[PDB]
Write a protein that binds this ligand. Structure first.
Ligand code: ADP
Ligand code: VO4
Ligand code: MG
Length: 706
């Protein structure tokens, strides 16, 4: 029936379906009666599994939710929601990404094909060529939402398309770039078995005529901590376990290592084996990528060797001679050999680092705690610089002579996360997520409406309540969290509790997003809460000062410069601005570069905590849609004018409909006036015609009929 089919709220599944008898029979048999305002209307059965939710008769939270659920139940993981797309992780291989599908998607306008990541990529390609404007596919979502998978699919689309008309070709190299970086930059966290522990902006360059000419990858802050430290239910980087699988046994001999991960302390404090990952086939995938990318055998063995030496570096034991002196050089020797260093000099550098007395030097003393930190810090430093060397190396092969004119950047940041223990690297991760959401908010809600004003369109502003400046300002602005941290790791007599005290003194009761920690019994200790867009996060400030300073035993880095392993020497070649400072510098650099592109938002949704295919946790999925502003992003499309054409281009294409109607603007007034259309569905701007949602479809349908 018309009014019988309704949605009623539900304390366990957010909302549930109902049949009116206000008293109504629930989808699950519960005879429940509720308040008339709490009842939302179901959409007609013609809109079941709708490809675009802006086309629904009833727009509300359960109408969107149940449509997404319905599509997901038929394994339809892509859905349009106004000018952007939403995708729910299937946690399962679907046959929607083959070459035959890629080929079919080529050139098809959004409406001419089912919703898909291929359609986003293709239409970004058409906009780039048509408007002569750089494009950017911006993929959002928490840890394990599916950003990396969708990112790899955009590359796949472009690479397959460019092939239809180092060792490999530009297209294969662009594809293989991801398995090479994932090996060293991805790791199993609680939420994701292949969690991206770093952000990346991949630009795909095209010539004036659309030919794929080049590519570049820029990465953002890697989780160095992971190299030498793990939480209970997480692993170190993929590579360590892949190398230990022994699929390449020469590697173990070269790296002087056992096959047991539990032998190496740096890499075995959490988990070692992951059901989802076959570390052995993965090592082959890792190695193969390096070959296709043009990495020499010395280049490869140098990366392997440096990883190996890092493992031994962890097992370097130290004792009291307060002054530390070594406690067995066995592992210290294995590391120095692999690193092209003198083992005695490495240990003298560690236990007694120099202090320059003009042109002479005097050593300083170090205790076992000081040496153990120094040792850990140098391994993280190496790994970070090795990942950086590897990215520049990939770029060097991807950088072709070929002429470029445009680009399509694809942003794959590390997703929003909440662990049992959240520290500095969680803050940097969630900060980016907050920033990108605000980028969506500003583009979708602010710039959009300011275009209607610019064009002299009759429009009365809408406040969608989509603004995160308060929380962004708290983290980045002066006297914010990072500003306080930056100043504190400058005063040498500062402590974790002086930074914690300064944090509280400036924001407790002053900043609304800065709150006391909501510490629950058993869980690790936290110092403050941060009301982020996707949740409140309890951060622990222990060690943040040293994380931001990131000092190294300079005496050991000098031996690294002097190393007889070309790679290790060049990693520290220029060695001599805090972590958070460069993080904000890079983030602001990125947000402004994305301002100069036409953006394409792909919103990934994690369906459940248990990595369960087809299974949707209504509360969790709704929370995502809510903190993403999906319902707001659809409303601005329905309530506004999402489509607009210049008077010239409207004449050049649609004059055919009624050639009797032909000035460029006056002609469009006659053409639209003469056609049988709702004369409220279009408004005249200074230089453009503003179409209400759907009308442009009718006009392109009427153009095809002759
Ligand atoms: N479209 C998809 N098809 C199949 N599996 C997917 C898809 N998207 C995500 N997944 C699954 O989710 C996991 C995590 O996805 P991923 O993109 O790596 O997460 P994140 O948002 O952290 O980058 C993948 O390893 C895979 O199992
Ligand atoms: O798990 V993530 O790839 O979103 O960091
Ligand atoms: Mg990722």
């Amino acid at each position: 029936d018309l009014k019988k089919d309704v949605f009623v709220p539900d304390d366990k599944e957010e909302f549930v379906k109902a049949t009116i008898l206000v008293t109504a029979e629930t989808e699950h048999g519960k005879t429940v009666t509720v308040k008339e305002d709490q009842v939302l209307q179901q959409n007609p059965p013609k809109f079941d599994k709708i490809e675009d939710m802006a086309m629904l008769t009833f727009l509300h939270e359960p109408a969107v939710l149940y449509n997404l659920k319905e599509r997901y139940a038929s394994w339809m993981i892509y859905t349009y929601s106004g000018l952007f797309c939403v995708t729910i992780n299937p946690y399962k291989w679907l046959p929607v990404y083959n070459a035959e599908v890629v080929a079919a998607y080529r050139g098809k306008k959004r409406s001419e094909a089912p919703p898909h990541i291929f359609s986003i990529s293709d239409n970004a390609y058409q906009y780039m060529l048509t408007d002569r404007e750089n494009q950017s596919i911006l993929i959002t979502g928490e840890s394990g939402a599916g950003k990396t998978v969708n990112t790899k699919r955009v590359i796949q689309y472009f690479a397959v398309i460019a092939a239809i008309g180092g060792k490999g070709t530009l297209e294969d190299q662009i594809i293989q770039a991801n398995p090479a970086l994932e090996a060293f930059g991805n790791a199993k966290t609680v939420r994701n078995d292949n969690s991206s522990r770093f952000g990346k902006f991949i630009r795909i360059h095209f010539g004036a005529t659309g030919k794929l000419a080049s590519a570049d990858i820029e990465t953002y802050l890697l989780e160095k901590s992971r190299v030498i430290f793990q939480l209970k239910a997480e692993r170190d980087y993929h590579i360590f376990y892949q190398i230990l699988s022994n699929k390449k046994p020469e590697l173990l001999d070269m790296l002087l290592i056992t096959n047991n991960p539990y032998d190496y302390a740096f890499i075995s404090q959490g988990e070692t084996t992951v059901a989802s990952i076959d570390d052995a086939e993965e090592l082959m995938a890792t190695d193969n990528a390096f070959d296709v990318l043009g990495f020499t055998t010395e280049e490869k063995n140098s990366m392997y060797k440096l990883t190996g030496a890092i493992m031994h570096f962890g097992n370097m034991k130290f004792k009291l001679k307060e002054q530390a002196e070594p406690d067995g050089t066995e592992e210290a020797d294995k590391s120095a050999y692999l690193m092209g260093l003198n083992s005695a000099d490495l240990l003298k550098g560690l236990c007694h680092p120099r202090v320059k007395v003009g042109n002479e030097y005097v050593t300083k003393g170090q205790n076992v705690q000081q040496v153990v930190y120094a040792k850990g810090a140098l391994a993280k430093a190496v790994y970070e610089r090795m990942f950086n060397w590897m990215v520049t190396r990939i770029n060097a092969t991807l950088e072709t002579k070929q002429p470029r004119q445009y680009f399509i950047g694809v942003l794959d940041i590390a997703g929003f996360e909440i662990f049992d223990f959240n520290s500095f690297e969680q803050l940097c991760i969630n900060f980016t997520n907050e920033k990108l959401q605000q980028f969506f908010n500003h583009h979708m809600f602010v710039l959009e409406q300011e275009e209607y004003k610019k064009e002299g369109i009759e429009w009365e502003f809408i406040d969608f309540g989509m603004d995160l400046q308060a929380c962004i300002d708290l983290i980045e602005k002066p006297m914010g969290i990072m500003s306080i941290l930056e100043e504190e790791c400058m005063f040498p007599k500062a402590t974790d509790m002086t930074f914690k005290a300064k944090l509280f003194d400036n924001h407790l009761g002053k900043s609304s997003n800065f709150q006391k920690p909501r510490n629950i019994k058993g869980k690790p200790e936290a110092h403050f809460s941060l009301i982020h867009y996707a949740g409140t996060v309890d951060y622990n400030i222990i060690g943040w000062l040293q994380k931001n300073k990131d000092p190294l035993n300079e005496t050991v880095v000098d031996l690294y410069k002097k190393s007889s392993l070309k790679m290790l020497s060049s990693l520290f070649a220029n060695y001599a601005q805090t972590v958070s400072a460069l993080h904000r510098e890079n983030l602001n650099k990125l947000m402004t570069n994305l301002r100069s592109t036409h953006p394409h938002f792909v919103r990934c949704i994690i369906p459940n905590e248990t990595k369960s295919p087809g299974v949707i946790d209504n509360p969790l999925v709704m929370h995502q849609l809510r903190c993403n502003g999906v319902l707001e992003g659809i409303r601005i499309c329905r309530k506004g004018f999402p489509n607009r054409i210049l008077y010239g281009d409207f004449r050049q294409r649609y004059r055919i409909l009624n050639p009797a109607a032909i000035d460029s603007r006056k002609g469009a007034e006659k053409l639209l006036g003469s056609l049988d259309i709702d004369h409220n569905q279009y408004k005249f701007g200074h230089t453009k015609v503003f179409f209400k949602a759907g009308l442009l479809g009718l006009l392109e349908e009427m153009r095809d009929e002759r």
